[PDB]
Design an enzyme around this catalytic site. Structure first.
Site, PDB file in Angstrom:
ATOM      1  N   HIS A  71       0.824  -1.206   0.000  1.00 28.49           N
ATOM      2  CA  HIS A  71       0.000   0.000   0.000  1.00 28.49           C
ATOM      3  C   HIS A  71       0.859   1.257   0.000  1.00 28.49           C
ATOM      4  CE1 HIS A  71      -2.840  -3.096   1.239  1.00 28.49           C
ATOM      5  NE2 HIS A  71      -3.824  -2.262   0.959  1.00 28.49           N
ATOM      6  N   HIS A  78       1.570  -3.672   9.602  1.00 30.27           N
ATOM      7  CA  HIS A  78       2.963  -3.752   9.202  1.00 30.27           C
ATOM      8  C   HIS A  78       3.831  -3.216  10.327  1.00 30.27           C
ATOM      9  CE1 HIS A  78       3.002  -5.168   5.049  1.00 30.27           C
ATOM     10  NE2 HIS A  78       1.911  -4.456   4.831  1.00 30.27           N
ATOM     11  N   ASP A 113       8.943  -1.892   7.949  1.00 34.82           N
ATOM     12  CA  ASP A 113       8.496  -2.175   6.588  1.00 34.82           C
ATOM     13  C   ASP A 113       8.145  -0.886   5.860  1.00 34.82           C
ATOM     14  OD1 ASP A 113       8.696  -4.601   7.787  1.00 34.82           O
ATOM     15  OD2 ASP A 113       6.741  -5.359   7.138  1.00 34.82           O
TER      16      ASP A 113
END
EC number: 2.7.8.-
Lengths: 264, 264, 264, 264, 264, 264
Positions: free
Chosen positions: C158, C201, C205
């Site tokens: 994303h 996440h 990340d």
């Protein structure tokens, strides 16, 4: 040259109206926060504890608003560049109310104890609140057409309206009629005093509201006269839709007059 | 030319300290209007409701303030116009604290519900008011040296000091040192956030206590840059004792740095 | 000169779709390594331990991703050289999602405890893995069209899409629109924040995804503007299929806008 | 011209030692977060699952470290501008270890199962953590002088030192010695393979450490050769204390060798 | 000039196929020496002792060879001088394979214990040896079409083919395509590693079966480039049928490609 | 000009001795791999199966070696530039034996069955093997001074020494004495034939050994004559310490004679 743009003024007119609708929608959301909102007795205000509450003071401010609007449309009717003035009114009223909405969302400060017969309330729904919005929106906020029944918060729009009308009235008049300017200042001050004596707003509610609109109006007029929107990268303007509206106007507009109709 | 008039710095200093004394008096004067002050529920906010109170967040504010003051003292020690920067700072804090006094005198807005353990109260007499104020005076309003025990009012002074000592170290350093400026920006931002997280002031207090200092600093420096006080009858400047303090200053202050001590 | 090549764009679209299909299958292969992935406790983080889980925060990321997609689609329609823009977007989304596949195959880092609904599994076959890969492929990996049943590994996807769309919107609009740029940056930052706020996440990340997308975009544009594909044997550019797409484009792409339709 | 500044190298060494102490203290603090960190099973890797553990493979990395350090110290002895080399090495290692500290703070990723003898812990005081920090600090973090009892977190440290020493040896030798360069590269690659094969770090740890060290070294040398610190306000170099060290060095450092002792 | 003489290409092809025929014969003639061949333990090595026997890697060798020869066929189709490349290729394989014949005749090196289940043996006659050789001949020696059931001998030909088809793709393509060269290098290295990992040949087989081919390729290419065969009595070249094949070609063969079908 | 460097020849003479010692050390390590090495039957060679074992051929192999050494020292005694010849011989014998060591470590190939009764073996220690190496080192390998008791491996050094001495003897004589060259070549052939006939080495052991030294010696002399070590970037010479020794020698060394002593 000064080219009257008859199709931009339509956009400017929808701008102020949608902003008014958004402000009305935001107003009902703030009222949901505190359910009772009528149990606090008034905080000490050195202006409030002196003047007793006057029930009819609020409507006098409103009739002041109507008479000032009458004078302004009288000036608006007999001016060559009426489009520019009508565009500027909407373009400058479409930002103070956005600042009002931001201040409303950040914090809420109502006047604690008046309009305790405030009806309605406890609106649990996702559709009826919209109907309350059109009730607020399509009443222009006047108590003459009874819509404003319940309390009002910080940053009163009445003072913004009065002083915004007064500044445009006194600015678009020649430097030889210094007798209507004094009168207009008189009614503006009387309206401010009568809103203060109505036990409807606090002193800090009106001081900030007056200062912000005065500073913004002066800044807009100075920038328009200087025409720095295209001269260079003056200040990275944050005015909502400023260069779009004021691209075709250069310099300072004059104050000439004519007759609008073709039958003198 | 820039002549250091040491007889003017003393006058500016005594002026700002008597302003401090007047402010210390007026907090005590405004205190007894309400006796309880401690029963109401907070007004609905957007930041005081989400973030829970952090008991130790109110120490980092004055740690940040002391660090900024130490940096400003270091800057003031090595500048040849050490008689001018201090005078300008004294002239600015006087005005901002007069504005703070007027705002707290016209209306009072205290967080209702912090410092409920503070003692004293009902100081009804002529002579113990000055004792309480002198106790407030000779404590700099800090909590490390515990002086302020009850609540605080509108227009927080910690914001004003933290912002003035940030915009004063940035302005009077070379325009190639934009790291100490960056570090002081983080300093000021953390000092701003920790006051709000300590449930000490409303969210609209900090914003209008930061914007006013920024505007009153930029306007004052623009006025000083163009020497408009003596150039013409520009605007009848409203700064208390404006032309008096800076009548001997022309042009723009240079940036050169020197060591005053004669021990290389 | 700028020659619109209408077959290289189709080749680029085929390439990006092949890359997406390979990524979807690799994401199914990786989940086979260790079955549980949901019994261990989460690694000690600085963001996942302070902010509690917000159940609805993950849909706002995709909402902000659709808003930016709509804006970029608007930009892609009112441009002269839309073919070059589409070709560059595809040629970058291929490379970044190839790097994601590599870094997710090397080591698999998931969040131990979200999407505990992941059950049954045991996809032991060659013709049942393909069906699961196709299910993810023709759902765009979004959570609205439910395909996001299990978790997502290293190098979040994303963040890549959000940052690429924001940077493309900022780059290919006139350098005088400095309000749309701020809105795009705010949307990108909020979309990045809502990924961590939903416990999807780790804090490392997102940072590496953001850094890699930014660095690759800037490097690609620097190489394209320098035009080093035919200047000399500078550094043996390692961008997959770079000289093929940019051989017919020399120099820099201007910012001319028009209206494609034959009915003005 | 190249001026040997012997009063800046001492400052650089002090800065490096301070950074090393801070990193050791932060590691001691980070170990306090998770009590066990030795009961979970390891993450699925591609290298840690194929190659079985080699007990003696962790000393060879440090042995290659001593070999490369001896070669570099030999180079440092027989150079004309040894001061600049010693000033650059420290100013790079400090920044890289600050980055390692920041990366290790946000999320802590260890290898679950090596150094399982790490027990006792519960350093629930401030004057007992300092003793452990000093024990780690004055042991250089190596395993030969036993301080490596517990594990090591994200952004491995051995890879940074090995890569930095290899790149420095390669850079500052005449460009005709293409056998020493191959030996240094072989030693660096073998050290990386041995740190990976002893089950002390994940593959992504080593990869990101290698990439970050390489990119930082190349960027620093490009900036130094371009002499952009005084050319213009190019990009606001973010290297901690960069212009203070390279202000007196203009252009590129040549490769002149000599002998410092006056006894042929 | 470069005149395509197909009658020479046909003779070269039949000659090299004859070389395959005698290689197939000599394998059978050398098989009959030692009956058992499967009782001894393998001689000490470094790569056959550490890496365990894995049984599927020996297929990847001919998969890589098939991909390489497909790429070579694609190259040969589009190159105008297709009559010259095939002739040179046949002339090179003839030489390298007669060298293989000499090596297996003089000594026989095999793996003592692998392929122990292969049947047949004791082919004592004049005629069944021919049948076994034809069985070896008409399978091209891969294990996918199972012919090579027993052990193999000195100087593996898989290395020779895998390296020749790599060094012909690199040489006879424009010197700007160093990606297919990079891909072919990986194709060659993996084929080298997998035949060793299959415990099929000793570690000294591959090294001298690769160096010999690369040396005999570069030497022949240099001789062809400088036309030393007819320039003078240079060295009395020992290449079998050297001047006959290469008498009609002068200068350097260009790198231009064309499509020889007449269907655009 | 040709300047005899008397201090570099010392370094060259020590280098070959270190290489010999390293080879001797490596030889004993290979013997530790497999204990018996005397159970395998002769792997079938078309040469060894023809000639019965001869147990005096090994002695006259060393006899012809010593004869050729006597001739070579006779030539070295009456040459102007003896230093260059000695330096080249040492520098080439130090590289051929390094290649011997590498090929020795990679794989081991001994002759299975002769020297059944050599004593020693089962050396379990870390100090006695050094004494064994000194015994191997300080015996020069000849059987006249019995040191070589067990067998020898592939890549025999006897033929390397014979061919290397023969080529130096033949090369440094003018092209008018084509009678001693015949004797040198026939003695070399007799030595290699006696090596083959007495069952100590295989044919593939001697073929590669002869070819490697021949090619390396020819390449070294061609490079020295052409003087490409300083002309340009010729081939990235991998010769151990080539440019160091031959920096002061240019062109071709002639063959003038003199008488060494001062008493003709």
């Amino acid at each position: 040259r000064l080219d009257p743009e008859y199709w931009k003024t339509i956009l400017s007119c929808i701008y102020v109206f949608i902003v008014f609708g958004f402000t009305s929608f935001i107003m009902v959301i703030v009222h949901e926060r505190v359910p009772d909102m009528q149990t606090y007795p008034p905080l000490p205000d050195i202006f409030l504890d002196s003047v007793p509450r006057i029930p009819w003071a609020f409507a006098m401010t409103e009739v002041c608003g109507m008479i000032l609007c009458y004078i302004w449309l009288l000036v608006l009717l007999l001016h060559k560049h009426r489009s520019i003035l009508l565009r500027r009114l909407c373009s400058l009223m479409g930002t103070v109310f956005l600042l009002r909405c931001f201040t409303m969302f950040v914090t809420s400060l109502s006047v604690p104890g008046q309009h305790l017969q405030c009806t309605g309330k406890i609106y649990g729904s996702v559709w009826e609140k919209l109907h309350r919005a059109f009730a607020i929106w399509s009443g222009f906020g006047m108590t003459l057409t009874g819509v404003h029944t319940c309390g009002d918060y910080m940053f009163s729009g009445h003072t913004v309206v009065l002083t915004m009308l007064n500044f445009f009235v006194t600015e678009y008049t020649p430097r030889s009629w210094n007798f209507l300017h004094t009168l207009s200042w008189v009614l503006n001050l009387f309206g401010i005093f009568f809103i203060l004596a109505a036990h409807e707003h606090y002193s800090i509610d009106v001081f900030i509201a007056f200062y912000i609109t005065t500073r913004l109006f002066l800044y807009y007029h100075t920038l328009a006269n200087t025409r720095a929107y295209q001269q260079s990268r003056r200040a990275r303007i944050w005015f909502p839709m400023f260069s779009f509206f004021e691209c075709n106007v250069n310099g300072t507009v004059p104050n000439e007059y004519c007759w609008p109709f073709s039958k003198p």
